[model samples]
Target: SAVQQKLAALEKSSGGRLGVALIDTADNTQVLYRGDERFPMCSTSKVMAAAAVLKQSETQKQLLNQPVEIKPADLVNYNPIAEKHVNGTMTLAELSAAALQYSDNTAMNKLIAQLGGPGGVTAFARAIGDETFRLDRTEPTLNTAIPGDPRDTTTPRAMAQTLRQLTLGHALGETQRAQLVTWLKGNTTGAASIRAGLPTSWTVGDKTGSGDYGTTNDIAVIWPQGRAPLVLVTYFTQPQQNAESRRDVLASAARIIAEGL
Candidate 1:
């Protein structure tokens, strides 16, 4: 198959660890290219954390619109939410939007704090039957240079399964699911990632992650015209010489699945 052939070419060109999983929801078939290996998740973990928050909202009758305040101390470097606004109060939903749509580190840390730290996020994963994924620390503590720490790590297969559950409405209630999807679709980051590889006729709701350590990851639910939606999850590790190459790898992987379908 051209897709498999292209995947081989991608592996050869990557010069680093690569993990790719493409699932066709239409037929429930998948192509796994080193999909079981674990890699740093980075901000891609935001979606899982968002789902956890949504679950808490549903079970506890907590409204996403509930107000939360961001103090000056809450601020952190790298896409800090404070950069966009002076310390102010906003709904949990708004914070989630910032975290998911803009990949704001402070917003994500606030969400993690609301959930009682990384344990809460990992608990959500365990409840959903994901054994290999774990959220060990807050975003500010994550050291991309030290990949050995389980601070934020997930196997490609685990992420793929999680995406499947999220898309199937198993992770969150309909209202929360819609909110999550909205955030994902509104994502302005990763223009050079998987979405770039898709045909103009299709639509993709995705979350992307990157690190200074040359980690580039994308997980998306795609809707090709007149077909059942599918999920594409890709992760790359090891310090690459260039970031564009990694983006191209993701785009090419997305194209392989999109065109093959």
Candidate 2:
């Protein structure tokens, strides 16, 4: 567990709350640092929301083809893609794309609605055998990152477990899994964290999260040339919302992981 101790050393030096879990699913070897502590998941929860929508599509194909109209009011701060299609109907598939790739707020809201709200995302996590991942609020509201409030939160271990199952396990069928991985691979929100630490030859698909208390996070599935896939989840939180995100520190932590591997 040298990796675990290394990550723990990083956490102790971090001035804010830090949580991390790294799983090399190939052989089930991994590391954890405060892995069970609840942390705000922020926008990253959209991965499950989108997955839930896709799972519903398995039983009823209409969820994929069905069109849902967007109103301007439905839009939120980070909704660039949704802004372009205001007053127009967007298919569930397109919404799912925006939710993960573009991190569009309205797209996430619309998609989460299709799954019956935040609770439905929790259902998807449970379906994946992740007992710790939970969502209690919708977009913008869920990003509050209130200290000690467990609502709309997840542990690093829980997030890593479910992401692994969804991306690499049987929790999702092939078609749905393929589609979800595609978006996360192309996700626009990474570059300064996990992705920054690895060489270009490595393949990575990730979802990023941010919220109050200077919270910034990333969860990713990575593929190296010589090893099987690795699923990593890292969450950082400071006491003040204005505290700048420590993207550099995350990259350093990632480098430690890559080097140790």
Q: Which sections of candidate 1 miss by over 4 Å?
A: 143-149, 240-245
* Highest TM-score scorer: 2
How much is the lDDT of residue 17 in candidate 2? 80
Candidate 2: RMSD to truth: 1.3
lDDT (tens digit, per residue) of candidate 1 on 148-250 = 5565788787798888887664677898788788888888886789889997888888888877567778898888889898888988776543444377778
In the predicted model 1, the residue pairs found to clash are none
User: Candidate 2 at 154: error in angstroms?
Assistant: 0.6
Runs of candidate 2 exceeding 4 Å displacement = none
lDDT of 1: 0.80
